[model samples]
Target: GAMARAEEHIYREIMELCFVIRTMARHRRDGKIQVTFGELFDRYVRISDKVVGILMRARKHGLVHFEGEMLWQGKDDHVVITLLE
Candidate 1:
């Protein structure tokens, strides 16, 4: 249940970030956006700090994974680094 909980937390964070990105993109398209990342970071300091802290914790806990493919090889790989329990 711990792993499931961890996954759920990560999913929620990802979804929230995606929503923010989408909203920003839409505002930009509508020419209603005039804020930079710095301004946003200043305005949403707590949320931004929490996101950064989560990422750092993920890396330290080995919960941060990566998937990528090389264009030349056309092969992809998934990496998993287990966290210390």
Candidate 2:
């Protein structure tokens, strides 16, 4: 399904971003370092603009949910995503 694929794409991007955040956090103990959506997209992700657009759309539609601190839900309704650290 298109929705499932979109959700998966978003999930992958989020996970990759989480990995980046964790890596950065490890390098800096202060925990002041942060990555924005643009940074995540630009630095870590390699997906096409269409896929990125889908992710952004999912965010807008609430199909992709985030809790700020760590967790998120994709369109599948069962995949619980969390930042590494």
Candidate 3:
């Protein structure tokens, strides 16, 4: 299919942008906000590998930091986002 990766791109874009703004706001207000990776998957859309995939994309885009820990307040943090259909 010509749109196989399209889904990935769209979902990742939304998650990245959404988290970008969220992080910015939290930064302005809260000194530090720690959100778990699993929480994001529940927050945005679903529970699946795609959710993890979109989050990975966010890390690459510099929106979050992926590690063996939770998602803290910053432009870069650990998060898990899903792609809604």
Candidate 4:
């Protein structure tokens, strides 16, 4: 019972993350939807406080791409984010 609920919740969360990226990101000449961590956070914080966590989730499932293992507020602000699918 609880298992299905958790699975659906995760699915929705990742979908929302992708929607946000596509909305606020810029389209690169190379045909990619991309945004910087700083830029994304500026808008993402309005929806959820768990920024890095969701981003990590997106990366794990191949929904998004970035460098390094983790991110910090000002330290990783400029990190480029590329959305896949």
Poorest lDDT segment (10 consecutive residues) of candidate 4:
1-10
The number of the candidate with the highest TM-score is 4
Question: Tens digits of per-residue lDDT for model 4 on 1-85?
Answer: 2232222134556666766765676452234467788888887788885666778777767766688887788999888876664
Candidate 1: regions farther than 4 A off: 1-13, 27-36, 42-51, 54-85
TM-score of each: 0.25, 0.27, 0.35, 0.67
User: Where does candidate 3 clash, by residue pair?
Assistant: 64-77, 65-77
lDDT of 1 by residue, 1-85 (tens): 2223233234444444433433433443432223233333333454553333333443444433422221111122122212211
lDDT of each: 0.34, 0.37, 0.42, 0.67
Give a tens-digit lDDT track for model 3, residues 1-85.
2334333244446544455334423431332233445454445443232344555555564544455433444432244332231
Preferred candidate (TM-score higher): 1 or 3: 3
Question: RMSD in angstroms, candidate 1?
Answer: 13.6
Q: Which scores higher on lDDT, 3 or 4?
A: 4
Candidate RMSDs in Å, in order, are 13.6, 13.4, 11.7, 8.9
Per-residue lDDT over 41-80 for candidate 2, one digit per residue giving the tens place of the 0 to 100 score: 4444454322234445335435334334332323222333
Q: How high is the lDDT of residue 36 in model 4?
A: 80
Residue ranges of candidate 4 with Cα displaced over 4 Å: 1-14, 26-31
* lDDT of residue 52 for candidate 2: 34
- The residue-level lDDT of candidate 2 at 76 comes to 27
